[PDB]
């Protein structure tokens, strides 16, 4: 092909931060920016993501009060659940559980997911248990885009592309003034940069 793209670089700084730079070359003048801006807006806004949207501690002392034998408050564990990264392709509403029954660290690896969801980083700490409590919590997971607004709601955001950039460079044809586009994508491991570029 004349017009060609390649994955010029990729990195995996963590299970929760991939990076990828892509090239697309022999673009014509004014094509590269029309591509770049639309692709940026697609990546940053029109990519969908999967995350936990609701939590239900199966024993609740009070809606706002502390929880016994956990080394941090219900709010800290709800924030740690907010930071969970999920990999699902199927839309719709889904459910999950944590049932950890002793002292130790509860982590994303301990989440019992439905068949259609995958943990992106098993190692993500969720909660510290000092006491041998049969801590059971239900979770409800949704796939959507952007953001959305008794069991706790989680103020989670469905945006797996963590950042994106593009640069436009003269290819140097003195008449046709062709151009090179570079795109850069940082993502949660919910998508690889290439998969986010395709879905965008």
């Amino acid at each position: 092909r004349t017009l060609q793209w390649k994955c010029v670089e990729s990195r995996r700084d963590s299970k929760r931060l991939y990076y990828g730079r892509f090239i697309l070359s022999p673009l014509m003048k004014g094509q590269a920016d029309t591509i770049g801006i639309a692709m940026r807006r697609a990546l940053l806004g029109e990519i969908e993501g999967t995350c936990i949207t609701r939590a239900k501690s199966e024993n609740i002392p009070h809606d706002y009060s502390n929880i016994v034998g956990i080394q941090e408050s219900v709010h800290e564990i709800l924030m740690n659940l907010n930071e969970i990264v999920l990999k699902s392709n199927l839309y719709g509403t889904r459910n999950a559980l944590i049932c950890v029954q002793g002292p130790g660290y509860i982590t994303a690896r301990d989440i019992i997911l439905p068949p259609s969801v995958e943990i992106v980083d098993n190692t993500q700490h969720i909660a510290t248990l000092t006491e041998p409590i049969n801590l059971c919590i239900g979770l409800k997971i949704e796939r959507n885009r952007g953001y959305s607004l008794r069991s706790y709601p989680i103020d989670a955001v469905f945006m797996p592309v963590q950042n994106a950039n593009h640069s436009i460079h003269s290819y140097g044809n003195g008449n046709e003034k062709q151009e090179i586009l570079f795109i850069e994508i940082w993502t949660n491991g919910s998508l690889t940069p290439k998969e986010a570029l395709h879905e965008a």
């Binding site: 092909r1 017009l3 060609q4 793209w5 697309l24 094509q31 029309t34 591509i35 639309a38 395709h198």
Partner: peptide, 17 residues
């Protein structure tokens, strides 16, 4: 619309092995 689609399809180009 068609020219936009012609700009974005290139990212879905697979190439032969």
């Amino acid at each position: 619309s068609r020219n936009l689609i012609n700009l974005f399809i290139p990212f879905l180009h697979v190439e032969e092995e």
